């Protein structure tokens, strides 16, 4: 317990961003103890890939990059290597060689309301798919042929939609907060 990584500042953040404008916090110089989080009843998704799946119950010194965002329940499966879809393509992309953990949990109680929480957004149109860990927070009208235009107009679109999160809909349309952990091993020797 010599300087464990303060994960609670990430997972218990009062406000989470929209998946198109996903945010990263780096937690520096601490022993990743994500094994304590796996133990929790708290998480509906918990998938570690590569070396994070082998060192899952291990304790080691690293920098942790935490990517936070909200998605629909049906969209949570897109936060995985090799996946395609509007979130995977145009919002948040993991590399095929991803070696970290994906954590998600149902946030119906805080991210949905009786009349619909519409504060969270995703992008549905883009010219090309995102590279892994690329981020696009632009709001420029989209057209198939890439010529400038103002909506409303034939073949001219605004690229952002809202999630509509209600307390009446099933888990698939309910809100999920998602945290992606990337671990960066700290080396000792001098430069």
């Amino acid at each position, epitope marked *: 317990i010599t300087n464990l990584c303060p994960f609670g500042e990430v997972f218990n953040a009062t406000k989470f961003p929209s998946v198109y404008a996903w945010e990263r916090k780096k937690i520096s110089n601490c022993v990743a103890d994500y094994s304590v989080l796996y133990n929790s009843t708290f998480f509906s998704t918990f998938k570690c890939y590569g070396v994070s799946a082998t060192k899952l119950n291990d304790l080691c010194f690293s920098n942790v990059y935490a990517d936070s965002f909200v998605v629909k329940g049906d969209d949570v499966r897109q936060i995985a290597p090799g996946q395609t879809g509007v979130i995977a393509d145009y919002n948040y992309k993991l590399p095929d060689d991803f070696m970290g953990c994906v954590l998600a949990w149902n946030t119906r109680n805080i991210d949905a309301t*009786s*009349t*619909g929480n*519409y504060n969270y957004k995703y992008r*549905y*149109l883009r010219h090309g798919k995102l590279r892994p860990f690329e981020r696009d927070i632009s709001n420029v009208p989209f057209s198939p042929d890439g010529k400038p235009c103002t*909506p*409303p*107009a*034939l*073949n*001219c*679109y*605004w690229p*952002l*939609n*809202d999630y*509509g*999160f*209600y*307390t*009446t*809909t*099933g*888990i*698939g*349309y309910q809100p999920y907060r998602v945290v992606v952990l990337s671990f960066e091993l700290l080396n000792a020797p001098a430069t």
Partner: single-chain antibody, 228 residues
Framework: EVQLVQSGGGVVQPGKSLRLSCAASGFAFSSYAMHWVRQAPGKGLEWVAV????????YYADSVKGRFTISRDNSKNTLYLQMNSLRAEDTAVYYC??????????WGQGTLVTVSSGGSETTLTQSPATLSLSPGERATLSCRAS??????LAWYQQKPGQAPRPLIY???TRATGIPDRFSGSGSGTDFTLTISRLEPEDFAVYYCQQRSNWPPTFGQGTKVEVKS
């Protein structure tokens, strides 16, 4: 294929009661919210009520609040509406509809309810009222909302006397099965639906709907009719 078969229409007198049924098949009924929407004779669609997937949450338009009770039986895959103390204002074709987070992606056939013997909502303004075109021509329909709905607009196609059918969700995304000659555009208050290369089956009434500002509302429609 998702199927919703309604029953229990008929004519009643004012102050009387009726129950509408909607039997669901071809999907996991218990996972979806279910809505009631109604259409008064020769007019636009109005949102009535919604029940949650598990039947514990229920919400009603102000107009029918306190005398319409929505319910469901998840073993029977059936949705109900108990319509008590009916007025002339309630005369409508009633529709059950599967929830797509307050867009409506599958609709029952409709049941007419005639109550006749006595006896800050977001407004969606569609223009023109009618649009008279020939096959192969381009229809451009407009829907100006009173307040911003961002991109939270859907469009529906209604053939005469038949249930509405979703065309577009979220301003610009087509519903399943909808060919690419239909296209929608806009965010905020100014929205268009373009039907290019009009086909014989495209002649119908078209309804825009907002879901984000409570309660869900529909425009009064644009009739795309064959040019006489």
């Amino acid at each position: 294929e998702v199927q919703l078969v309604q029953s229990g229409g008929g004519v009643v007198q004012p102050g009387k009661s009726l129950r509408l049924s909607c039997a669901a098949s071809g999907f996991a009924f218990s996972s979806y919210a279910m809505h009631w929407v109604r259409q008064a004779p020769g007019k636009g669609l109005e949102w009535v009520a919604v029940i949650s997937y598990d039947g514990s949450n229920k919400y009603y338009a102000d107009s029918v609040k306190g005398r319409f009770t929505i319910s469901r039986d998840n073993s029977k895959n059936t949705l109900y509406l108990q319509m008590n103390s009916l007025r002339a204002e309630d005369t409508a074709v009633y529709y059950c509809a599967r929830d797509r987070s307050y867009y409506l992606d599958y609709w029952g056939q409709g049941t007419l309810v005639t109550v006749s013997s006595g006896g800050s909502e977001t407004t969606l303004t569609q223009s023109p009222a009618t649009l008279s075109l020939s096959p192969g021509e381009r229809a451009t329909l407009s829907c100006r909302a009173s307040q911003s709905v961002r991109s939270n607009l859907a469009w529906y196609q209604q053939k005469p006397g038949q249930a509405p059918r979703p065309l577009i969700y979220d301003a610009s995304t087509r519903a399943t099965g909808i060919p690419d000659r239909f296209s929608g555009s806009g965010s905020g208050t100014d929205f268009t639906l373009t039907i290019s290369r009009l086909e014989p089956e495209d002649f119908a009434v078209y309804y825009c709907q907002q879901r984000s500002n409570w309660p869900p509302t529909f425009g009064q429609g644009t009739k795309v009719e064959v040019k006489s």
